[PDB]
Amino acid sequence: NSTATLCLGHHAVPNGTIVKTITNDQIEVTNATELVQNSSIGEICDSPHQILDGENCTLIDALLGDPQCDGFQNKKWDLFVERSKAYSNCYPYDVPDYASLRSLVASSGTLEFNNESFNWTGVTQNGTSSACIRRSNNSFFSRLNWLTHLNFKYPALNVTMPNNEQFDKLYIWGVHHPGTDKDQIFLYAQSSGRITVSTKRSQQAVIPNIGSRPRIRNIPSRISIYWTIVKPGDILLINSTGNLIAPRGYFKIRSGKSSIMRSDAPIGKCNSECITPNGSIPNDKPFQNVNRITYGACPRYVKQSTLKLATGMRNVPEGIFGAIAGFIENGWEGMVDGWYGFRHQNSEGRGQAADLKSTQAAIDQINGKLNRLIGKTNEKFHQIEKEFSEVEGRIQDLEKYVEDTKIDLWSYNAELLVALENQHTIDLTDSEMNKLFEKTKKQLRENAEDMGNGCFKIYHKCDNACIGSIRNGTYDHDVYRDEALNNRFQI
Amino acid sequence: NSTATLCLGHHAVPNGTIVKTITNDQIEVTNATELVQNSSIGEICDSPHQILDGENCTLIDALLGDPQCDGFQNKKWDLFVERSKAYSNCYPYDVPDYASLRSLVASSGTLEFNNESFNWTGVTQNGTSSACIRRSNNSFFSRLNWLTHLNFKYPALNVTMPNNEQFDKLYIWGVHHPGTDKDQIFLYAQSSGRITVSTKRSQQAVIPNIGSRPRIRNIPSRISIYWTIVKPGDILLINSTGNLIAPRGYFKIRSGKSSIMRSDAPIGKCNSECITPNGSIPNDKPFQNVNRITYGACPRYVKQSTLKLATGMRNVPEGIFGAIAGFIENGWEGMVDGWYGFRHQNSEGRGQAADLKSTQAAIDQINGKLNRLIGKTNEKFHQIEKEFSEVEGRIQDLEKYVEDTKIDLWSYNAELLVALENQHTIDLTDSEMNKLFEKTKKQLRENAEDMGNGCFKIYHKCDNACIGSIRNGTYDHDVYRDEALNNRFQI
Amino acid sequence: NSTATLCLGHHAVPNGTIVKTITNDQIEVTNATELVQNSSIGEICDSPHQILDGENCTLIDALLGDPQCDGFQNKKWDLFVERSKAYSNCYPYDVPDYASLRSLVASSGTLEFNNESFNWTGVTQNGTSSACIRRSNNSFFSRLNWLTHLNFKYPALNVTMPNNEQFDKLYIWGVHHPGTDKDQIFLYAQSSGRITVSTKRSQQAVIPNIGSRPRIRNIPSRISIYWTIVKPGDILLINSTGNLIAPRGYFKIRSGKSSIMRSDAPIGKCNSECITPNGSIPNDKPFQNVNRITYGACPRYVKQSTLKLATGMRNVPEGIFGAIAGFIENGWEGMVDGWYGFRHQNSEGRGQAADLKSTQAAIDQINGKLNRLIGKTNEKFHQIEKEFSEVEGRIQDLEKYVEDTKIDLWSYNAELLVALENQHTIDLTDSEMNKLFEKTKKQLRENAEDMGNGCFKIYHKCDNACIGSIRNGTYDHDVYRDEALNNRFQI
């Protein structure tokens, strides 16, 4: 009682959180934050990306000009959304390398179309079908021109169209395969028919195949769709002796951030940068578990459902430096104004006071880690397909393997990052506690002794102002040294 | 001799192991474990994966029904093993996109076949050849039906088969290319021949090519093999005016964990989860150097032949805290009951005793690291091919580049992991030594002085029980303080 | 003045460098080195890789034997350089899967050609054109043999050539597509024409397409180029009823480190291991920002423009251990002979002296890090294409995605490496300072007190030799203990 006690300590909480570290699967810290986004609000926000809901139409149908898709003419988009309910209702068609055509249009991000005046002298234009009804009349694909005989003759066509513009042109055309030699005659007079479109660089030669296929909406015949790109200075050349489904012009083709996504999520009136087929997701977190398919500024897809980053010290209720969970037996739940602090007992009573500088030093370092991880996602746009409806073999094996490889490597990065940062966070918070203890020890010089539990026995009368002077670094040890030495060194 | 000495220390071994760290290429630790599996026992264990040894047959041969492969009918597998000795002994055939067909069947993991009654009215069935002898009789592929003329006519076929099941059907069929116009006539009457198989979604139109090719087992003619998948609600339609090698039914096609592997390793009667073409390998280690081609729960392939993870402290015979290989001059080889401990000299003699708590604290942290690395491999099944017998160009360049990219990234991860963990292991073991020293120092209060080499000069008579009380944390410094102070502070 | 002062400290510099760490975006260290190579000298060094400047010729042109490329006959290369100015000046041609042919030849790394004596009995050889003029005479591709009718007949060819060598043979051949039925007759007599080349394993059947295409240098007709590889024991078989552009022999095909690169950088007379299309770059740094396309022992391509690795301590003008930027208020700019040292004040004056052992300990650890990062790049040769002149869709999407995935993963590795190493460098340098302070403290025993700012108050007369004895570890505390204790413990 000619003595005082000053104890160093740290806070603790009743509701701790378990995190993983390098050396321990399960360690409790005072606070943590989740690094994996695991939920979507279920809506694709219409902002800030230009969304185009395909609704009942696929991109290719909107491209060809299925009557149902007339409203999509010349539209642009950042992201085209294809619905699973979509269906075609014009003339039955197939596209060799459908996936590539879908991909290049999606990436181009525009349906801008310019009509061109082709010289179809000698044939009937604007062929039409009951399989493709527009305004209650028999019709056809808006962007295609079905040519037939005129006066029972189909002269050999040799039609040309130069690109004298400064942009590429995307031409879509097709070949008709009648189900009977009869229909072939009726339509084109010729028995066979043959199509050949050329540029200076390319040749696409198609020979139609007369034959009945299983009926799609009662049609046993087909149209096969092809595309050719013509750059400035080049020339399109169309030779046909029949069966040619002619283009009415070209599509502008652009390069940019556009893409396409399969999803049944409704479009919402809201604003979110990251889109998944499940809906838009927040992008504050560096990782996400929602979908490997994404568009925009998105967290990276990982396999883990949760990854907790410690944002506080080890929680010790009741480190490499050995203070926290070390010579300091436990934390103080009653310290709610700081992370580290002092408890004292003197002549005037018992008190507690937080140390702000050490508290802030720990918090600044943790915020530095958070600044590296939170709100820094990277933009991805058009990628590769990652779900498949049909078996294809080799190329699909490769696309799947590439994505699986990527996810495992990011899942590894995420796992190690959290384990490493957490080990370091627990060590830096232990370090700050140790520094405060060491600083206090040096301050007291020969006037006190370390009791080994984070407490100092102070060998002199130390009232509240004296204790306060120690806490704020103005303690003058020389003032008390004589009193202290006499108390320490006696019998 | 009115004094005692208490020394803090750590163990050492005569047979140390060299490891790599962040700051040092070559540092000796007391113990380490290997992280790269570099050997196989040379056998593919038949458990716990269902192995199917192709022996003399390739998967495609077993699929088509080469007589040699009759025993493989309707078999399933987790892993099909193709031998380099395998050879075909039926009718000469090629498969366009052979690799894709092989891949999709392998992945399906079943040869389950259901016969279907096709209406081949107007043609001769069960065509047969001396190139494909079964039970000493001329025969053919068990799953294929060779159609020829009947009464010197081959009427146009238009055969249909609907899928009214709930599973997909895999149809295998082929086209015959006779080596002479003569054989073409003899077999099909028609001069040309043409095959066309269709679904609602697809058309495969093949025009046979009459001509002699270099003879395979004395046959200058060929059969080209094709496949079509028909989903529920869809319909197969076969038009042929000749040269059609007909299917006798369909294969069930499944999705699962099945795959195929090229290997000449014998099948063994044993149990191992990871299979490589070199044989099965243990999967206790996280990495392996045996083969980039694997199946099952396997360590990840890396380029390093060895990667040693330290599992003990730095070995100092004769860290950031500066105790081990620091102010403690060397380790104690004679300490074999613990990692850290005390050596003393007093009136009763000289002794040594291990400290169990600090020993266990270090061991627990190292075991925590091991638990993260040992026995946690990840299952891979069907992947991409990684060895190639023929030049292909673009697609093969891509498959090779993908695998090479993946291996370099995992080899990096493995290298950094070991360097980081080892640096940390050496630092945590140094830390535990420092904590024990600091704890002991505080215990002794004013009764001892640090001699600077991990030893304390104790300024009072301290018999064995006194030394023991220090080691077990029951030392009461107040008991000796007067004696100690008088000894310390004199002239 | 019956006392002395000994201060521990570290150096500082006026020109510090900002680096990134785990906990801080911007921290100043005494020195750093750049890890990202961002510049090229603009030349492709001709050493030590065998460079072949294509100049006006593409690889395929040199392969076919465009007259302009005669000088390239039988050349080999490690790297073939294609110029953007290159142009073809022989007969107009296209190659289906051009990219694959270009790739396999580039990778083979040789134009070694062996002539073979084919039996072209019944046809005219050495066909020739005004579209391909050699030495001012009408000519043709040096490696191809244009066959035409002889005496207005073109008999069915059935020509064979066995591979009885021990190496593979690469055969290049082609099909001619005349622009008129007239030219077809004039050249081959036959109305149609058909080509079929076979091996035991393969068949390539081409049917020429008569028709005019847009004129390339006034030619409306084309030659389509094909290749076939024939292994030892196999046989090439050529059937043609017309339009066959015949091979004159085979190319040797090798496997090795060769590749091809598009670049307009001049070839220089110098020596560099890493080549980019921008020019050769130094490979001392682990990363580079110059080009994702590389050949040789090259730093890895990353997205960051700069990544600074700290190679010195924190710069404090005017860590987890709390010495540097901690209880030591600031560094000493006047200490230029070491990183750590002593400053003293005694009866004889004030002095400064570096500590070499602690200085060297820090430097050795930093050099250990540098040794892991500097001068250890990995060799890559033939890879995948990474820039594209035409839209292709699916396969190109995959090639782009693979490269983008790889770069992001390496960019991550590089970012984390620097942040981690820098945090550790700052901590190890702080640690060395702390160790020196602790060692000095123990040396002084009871003869001095820690003033809390890295300085010791020494409680006895300590001349220059005495101070020197402390710095070199020969200080005998017992010599001064009586004097010191009397000074410390008084009133």
Ligand SMILES: *[C@@H]1O[C@H](CO)[C@@H](O[C@@H]2O[C@H](CO)[C@@H](O)[C@H](O)[C@H]2NC(C)=O)[C@H](O)[C@H]1NC(C)=O
């Ligand atoms: C080839 O076979 C198919 C199947 O029998 C025929 O297609 C059917 O034709 C009938 C009437 O002609 C339709 O009512 C069916 O809906 C069709 N079925 C399918 C699946 O398309 C086809 O007519 C036959 N070809 C010829 C020329 O006879």
Ligand SMILES: *[C@@H]1O[C@H](CO)[C@@H](O[C@@H]2O[C@H](CO)[C@@H](O)[C@H](O)[C@H]2NC(C)=O)[C@H](O)[C@H]1NC(C)=O
């Ligand atoms: C085309 O040429 C090949 C090679 O000369 C001929 O194939 C050979 O035919 C003979 C007997 O007819 C056999 O003994 C050889 O084994 C065959 N060689 C090969 C490599 O197949 C073929 O007959 C010729 N075509 C025609 C119709 O004459």
Ligand SMILES: *[C@@H]1O[C@H](CO)[C@@H](O[C@@H]2O[C@H](CO)[C@@H](O)[C@H](O)[C@H]2NC(C)=O)[C@H](O)[C@H]1NC(C)=O
């Ligand atoms: C098909 O159309 C093209 C374009 O009109 C014709 O090619 C032109 O032919 C004339 C003279 O015959 C040349 O002067 C032009 O340079 C050619 N243009 C191009 C782009 O090639 C071609 O002649 C026509 N085909 C036929 C058989 O008449």
Ligand SMILES: *[C@@H]1O[C@H](CO)[C@@H](O)[C@H](O)[C@H]1NC(C)=O
């Ligand atoms: C602990 O409780 C407080 C208030 O109830 C809350 O703010 C804090 O987030 C809780 N800790 C956690 C993360 O459970």
Ligand SMILES: *[C@@H]1O[C@H](CO)[C@@H](O)[C@H](O)[C@H]1NC(C)=O
């Ligand atoms: C837990 O940590 C996060 C990130 O620092 C912070 O947003 C949250 O407020 C913290 N909770 C408490 C109780 O401090």
Ligand SMILES: *[C@@H]1O[C@H](CO)[C@@H](O)[C@H](O)[C@H]1NC(C)=O
């Ligand atoms: C989509 O098609 C369905 C018919 O299945 C119809 O109910 C609906 O009106 C269509 N929506 C639009 C926008 O055309």
Ligand SMILES: *[C@@H]1O[C@H](CO)[C@@H](O)[C@H](O)[C@H]1NC(C)=O
């Ligand atoms: C074909 O129809 C389009 C509108 O669909 C029209 O612009 C054009 O005049 C028609 N051409 C002929 C010859 O009927």
Ligand SMILES: *[C@@H]1O[C@H](CO)[C@@H](O)[C@H](O)[C@H]1NC(C)=O
């Ligand atoms: C293909 O099948 C049907 C029925 O015979 C028909 O479309 C066509 O005539 C067939 N092909 C030939 C060459 O007869």
Ligand SMILES: *[C@@H]1O[C@H](CO)[C@@H](O)[C@H](O)[C@H]1NC(C)=O
């Ligand atoms: C998102 O969709 C996928 C299926 O495409 C599903 O596996 C996953 O559970 C969904 N995620 C969430 C959080 O809804």
Ligand SMILES: *[C@@H]1O[C@H](CO)[C@@H](O)[C@H](O)[C@H]1NC(C)=O
């Ligand atoms: C330090 O604490 C003492 C005691 O309360 C007080 O008198 C003084 O204002 C404080 N000094 C500073 C600089 O904060």
Ligand SMILES: *[C@@H]1O[C@H](CO)[C@@H](O)[C@H](O)[C@H]1NC(C)=O
């Ligand atoms: C050292 O020797 C002992 C027994 O001979 C053995 O258990 C230990 O593994 C050895 N250390 C190594 C890894 O060489």
Ligand SMILES: *[C@@H]1O[C@H](CO)[C@@H](O)[C@H](O)[C@H]1NC(C)=O
């Ligand atoms: C070396 O370390 C490994 C892993 O902890 C252990 O299995 C082995 O027993 C150790 N050897 C010795 C001598 O302790």
Ligand SMILES: *[C@@H]1O[C@H](CO)[C@@H](O)[C@H](O)[C@H]1NC(C)=O
């Ligand atoms: C495999 O083929 C060889 C002939 O090369 C023969 O010796 C052996 O009997 C065959 N094995 C089986 C199981 O058919």
Ligand SMILES: *[C@@H]1O[C@H](CO)[C@@H](O)[C@H](O)[C@H]1NC(C)=O
């Ligand atoms: C064809 O052979 C199979 C057995 O190989 C038999 O089931 C079928 O009855 C035969 N059909 C005819 C018409 O011979």
Ligand SMILES: *[C@@H]1O[C@H](CO)[C@@H](O)[C@H](O)[C@H]1NC(C)=O
């Ligand atoms: C192809 O070559 C051989 C020999 O002439 C034969 O199979 C066939 O007759 C040839 N093709 C034609 C169209 O004659």
Ligand SMILES: *[C@@H]1O[C@H](CO)[C@@H](O)[C@H](O)[C@H]1NC(C)=O
């Ligand atoms: C495994 O096989 C590969 C060849 O496929 C060979 O390069 C490697 O040396 C083998 N590994 C072992 C450990 O046998």
